[PDB]
Amino acid sequence: SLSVPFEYTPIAQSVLDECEHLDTASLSDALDSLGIDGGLPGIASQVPGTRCVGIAFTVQYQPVDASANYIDQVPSGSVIVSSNSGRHDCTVWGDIMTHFALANGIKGTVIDGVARDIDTVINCNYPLFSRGRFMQSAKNRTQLKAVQVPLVIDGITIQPGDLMVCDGSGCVVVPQQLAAEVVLRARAVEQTERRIIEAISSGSTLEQARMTY
Amino acid sequence: YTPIAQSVLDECEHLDTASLSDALDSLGIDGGLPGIASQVPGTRCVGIAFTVQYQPVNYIDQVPSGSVIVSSNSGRHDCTVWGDIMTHFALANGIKGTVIDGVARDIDTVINCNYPLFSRGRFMQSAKNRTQLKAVQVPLVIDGITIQPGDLMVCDGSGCVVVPQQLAAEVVLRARAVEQTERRIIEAISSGSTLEQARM
Amino acid sequence: FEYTPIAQSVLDECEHLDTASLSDALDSLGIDGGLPGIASQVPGTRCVGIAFTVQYQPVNYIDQVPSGSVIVSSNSGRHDCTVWGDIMTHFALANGIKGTVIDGVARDIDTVINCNYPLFSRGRFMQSAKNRTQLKAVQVPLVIDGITIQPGDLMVCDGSGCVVVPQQLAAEVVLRARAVEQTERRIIEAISSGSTLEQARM
Ligand SMILES: [Cl-]
Numbered sequence: 149s150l151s152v153p154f155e156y157t158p159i160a161q162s163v164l165d166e167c168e169h170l171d172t173a174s175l176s177d178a179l180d181s182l183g184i185d186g187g188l189p190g191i192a193s194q195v196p197g198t199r200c201v202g203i204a205f206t207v208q209y210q211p212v213d214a215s216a217n218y219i220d221q222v223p224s225g226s227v228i229v230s231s232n233s234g235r236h237d238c239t240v241w242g243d244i245m246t247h248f249a250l251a252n253g254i255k256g257t258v259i260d261g262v263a264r265d266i267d268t269v270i271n272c273n274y275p276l277f278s279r280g281r282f283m284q285s286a287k288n289r290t291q292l293k294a295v296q297v298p299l300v301i302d303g304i305t306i307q308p309g310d311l312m313v314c315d316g317s318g319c320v321v322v323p324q325q326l327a328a329e330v331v332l333r334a335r336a337v338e339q340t341e342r343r344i345i346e347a348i349s350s351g352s353t354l355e356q357a358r359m360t361y
Numbered sequence: 362y363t364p365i366a367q368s369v370l371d372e373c374e375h376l377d378t379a380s381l382s383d384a385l386d387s388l389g390i391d392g393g394l395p396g397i398a399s400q401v402p403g404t405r406c407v408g409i410a411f412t413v414q415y416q417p418v419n420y421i422d423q424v425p426s427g428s429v430i431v432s433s434n435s436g437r438h439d440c441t442v443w444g445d446i447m448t449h450f451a452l453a454n455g456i457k458g459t460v461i462d463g464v465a466r467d468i469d470t471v472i473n474c475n476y477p478l479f480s481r482g483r484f485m486q487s488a489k490n491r492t493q494l495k496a497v498q499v500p501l502v503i504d505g506i507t508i509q510p511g512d513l514m515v516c517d518g519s520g521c522v523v524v525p526q527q528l529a530a531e532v533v534l535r536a537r538a539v540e541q542t543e544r545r546i547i548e549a550i551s552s553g554s555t556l557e558q559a560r561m
Numbered sequence: 562f563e564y565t566p567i568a569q570s571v572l573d574e575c576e577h578l579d580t581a582s583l584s585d586a587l588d589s590l591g592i593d594g595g596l597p598g599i600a601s602q603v604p605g606t607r608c609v610g611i612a613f614t615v616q617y618q619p620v621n622y623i624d625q626v627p628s629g630s631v632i633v634s635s636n637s638g639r640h641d642c643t644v645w646g647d648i649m650t651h652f653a654l655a656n657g658i659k660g661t662v663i664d665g666v667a668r669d670i671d672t673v674i675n676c677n678y679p680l681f682s683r684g685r686f687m688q689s690a691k692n693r694t695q696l697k698a699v700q701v702p703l704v705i706d707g708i709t710i711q712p713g714d715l716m717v718c719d720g721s722g723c724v725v726v727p728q729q730l731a732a733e734v735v736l737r738a739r740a741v742e743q744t745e746r747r748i749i750e751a752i753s754s755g756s757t758l759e760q761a762r763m
Pocket residue numbers: 216241242243244245246
């Protein structure tokens with residue numbers, strides 16, 4: 149949380165477009181400069197060479213009680229962030245949802261938990277991030293509790309509307325109220341680093357490069 | 362102990378671990394082997410379990426064509442029970458894949474051979490003076506899931522499923538139903554149907 | 562113990578040897594060399610070189626790393642911060658560093674893959690070392706998975722993982738490992754032309 153109360157904050161398309169050229173590392177270093185951890189440890193890229201940027205649409209699961217359906221609600225440009233207590237014994241994403249995502253402008257799926265139909269996901273080149281791969285259905289194993297509620301994954305809060313950026317290094321949560329400022333800082337981090345890389349690739353010591361830049 | 366009909370094996374060749382698991386669920390059976398991951402991207406196998414039990418301190422000549430070797434090494438990470446020699450043997454003798462409760466070596470060879478290997482991970486220390494073959498063609502227990510010699514193994518990118526041989530026809534039939542239904546749902550989704558519309 | 566240099570021709574001969582062969586050779590001397598859980602992060606890569614060790618501790622050095630080194634970085638197996646990323650990858654490519662082995666995690670995996678740099682670690686993450694972990698010392702002994710790694714040891718890593726070869730035994734282990742592969746080649750060729758495994762062993 150922040151020094152100001154939480155408020156749903158729209159994020160300009162331009163800020164999202166900029167994230168096309170930003171790595172999770174830059175965004176994480178920017179967040180760190182604001183005193184905030186953003187990484188979701190253990191939530192790994194499952195499809196080589198993929199990445200996504202979009203607005204968190206949150207999904208929270210709970211134990212079966214009763215005594216995929218939510219996906220029709222998810223806006224174009226969303227990254228779905230699903231929390232199932234880090235469970236490895238059932239999956240909360242598969243082929244139907246993947247095909248749906250691809251047909252409905254959904255950018256990627258981040259899972260505190262596991263997914264199935266990995267071959268379809270790979271074949272579709274869909275940006276899936278999860279704690280792993282399994283095949284057993286959610287049916288009679290876990291059930292939807294609520295969507296568009298705050299999630300807490302490894303102590304990191306994800307609010308509906310937060311900026312999600314994911315790549316080969318994993319997933320970063322950027323609070324919506326800070327998104328423009330974090331993206332600005334991340335761009336500056338990338339610029340400084342590019343000069344450092346250019347320097348060491350021209351025979352500078354790292355020592356030299358780091359304090360000329 | 363029961364052979365499986367060839368037509369059941371043939372149908373299964375176009376089924377997924379998800380379809381088979383959903384079918385098993387409908388019969389009240391868990392099929393999945395948690396933690397036993399695909400080690401070779403893009404591979405799959407369907408075949409008959411030939412079982413191998415190791416114990417703390419070869420058999421391959423006995424393995425029938427069309428077998429999927431399922432080897433239990435108590436989930437150990439300090440030694441391996443599959444490597445290059447066995448991969449090359451499998452490929453020359455119609456062996457369809459290997460599933461290991463434990464780890465495998467010569468991962469680079471397995472990948473280059475496109476061999477369907479499924480394991481708890483990758484390592485290089487040899488079984489020799491670490492683990493020894495105890496028995497073959499005995500029932501195995503992996504993550505509480507029993508595997509009998511003869512059971513139908515189906516393995517892909519999502520992991521490995523054990524289908525009890527005595528029920529294989531019913532499971533495969535149900536699994537085909539699950540798959541046919543989903544194909545229709547996916548078709549409708551691609552033409553722009555809502556998920557609710559598609560499930561109606 | 563003694564610091565033991567290793568001839569370039571031994572390194573060159575080791576260039577194509579699989580980690581399985583080196584482990585089998587080590588076993589013949591009664592030595593465990595494998596680092597379980599330290600997994601290849603860049604499909605199809607491998608490295609051979611001399612361990613330059615780096616120890617981190619809870620809350621730079623790379624200019625001191627000789628060409629031909631494999632950097633072995635110990636970070637208590639931590640998953641919350643990374644000790645390798647894009648700057649260091651481009652440094653290694655410009656300075657003849659052969660690969661990096663991490664007891665912990667690395668970032669900028671997409672750059673590392675694109676540079677085809679041989680990286681081995683317990684995984685992938687993006688959070689910086691800054692204000693999370695700090696350099697303790699270099700060229701000190703490390704302990705990873707109960708295996709002691711001395712600066713100067715021969716490191717060999719591939720798809721199957723990472724092997725530590727004690728420098729005093731390195732030349733012997735490489736020669737034995739070559740023998741292992743030659744023996745196995747004859748077996749594989751017998752198998753591939755239709756021999757039983759039994760016949761192929763003899
Ligand atoms: Cl699905």
